[PDB]
Design a protein around this ligand. Structure first.
Ligand SMILES: O=C1c2ccc(O)cc2O[C@@H]1C1CCCCC1
Length: 133
């Protein structure tokens, strides 16, 4: 019953500061514009110890599967090749991505009926709110 409150299908309903977050990450202009326009659905499932997170939008469809605490290699939607580790910290899913001596963290947390995503790169934070589909 690891991650029960995260499991399901979630749809983006608001975003703040995402363009600036993507700039900080190094995403180029055209990708920022199309990715920032996206209205992704986040689909989270669990089977045993394996968690799967799918993101589907008109921009890109991606899928990761992982075990908490166990690093994996990821190609991100913006085509970075990163080494990722996802853990549960005090009920928050914490996703750290490392590449080229850089690091960014994506936190997913349940707050009321929402799933709130906080993306942090250095001093720039973007907050994205998802609701159940
Ligand atoms: O993994 C990510 C993620 C997941 C959910 C969300 O709402 C925002 C997110 O931003 C990142 C990256 C997406 C693709 C573009 C670069 C940033």
């Amino acid at each position: 019953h690891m991650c029960d409150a995260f499991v399901g299908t979630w749809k983006l309903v608001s975003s703040e500061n995402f363009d600036d977050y993507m700039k900080e990450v190094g995403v180029g202009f055209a990708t920022r514009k199309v990715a920032g326009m996206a209205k992704p659905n986040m689909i989270i499932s669990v089977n045993g110890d394996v968690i799967t997170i799918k993101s589907e939008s008109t921009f890109k469809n991606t899928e990761i599967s992982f075990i908490l605490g166990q690093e994996f290699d990821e190609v991100t939607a913006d085509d970075r090749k990163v080494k990722s580790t996802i853990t549960l910290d005090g009920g928050v899913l914490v996703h750290v991505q490392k590449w080229d001596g850089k690091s960014t963290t994506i936190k997913r947390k349940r707050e009321d009926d929402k799933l709130v995503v906080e993306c942090v790169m250095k001093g720039v934070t973007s907050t994205r709110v998802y609701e159940r589909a």
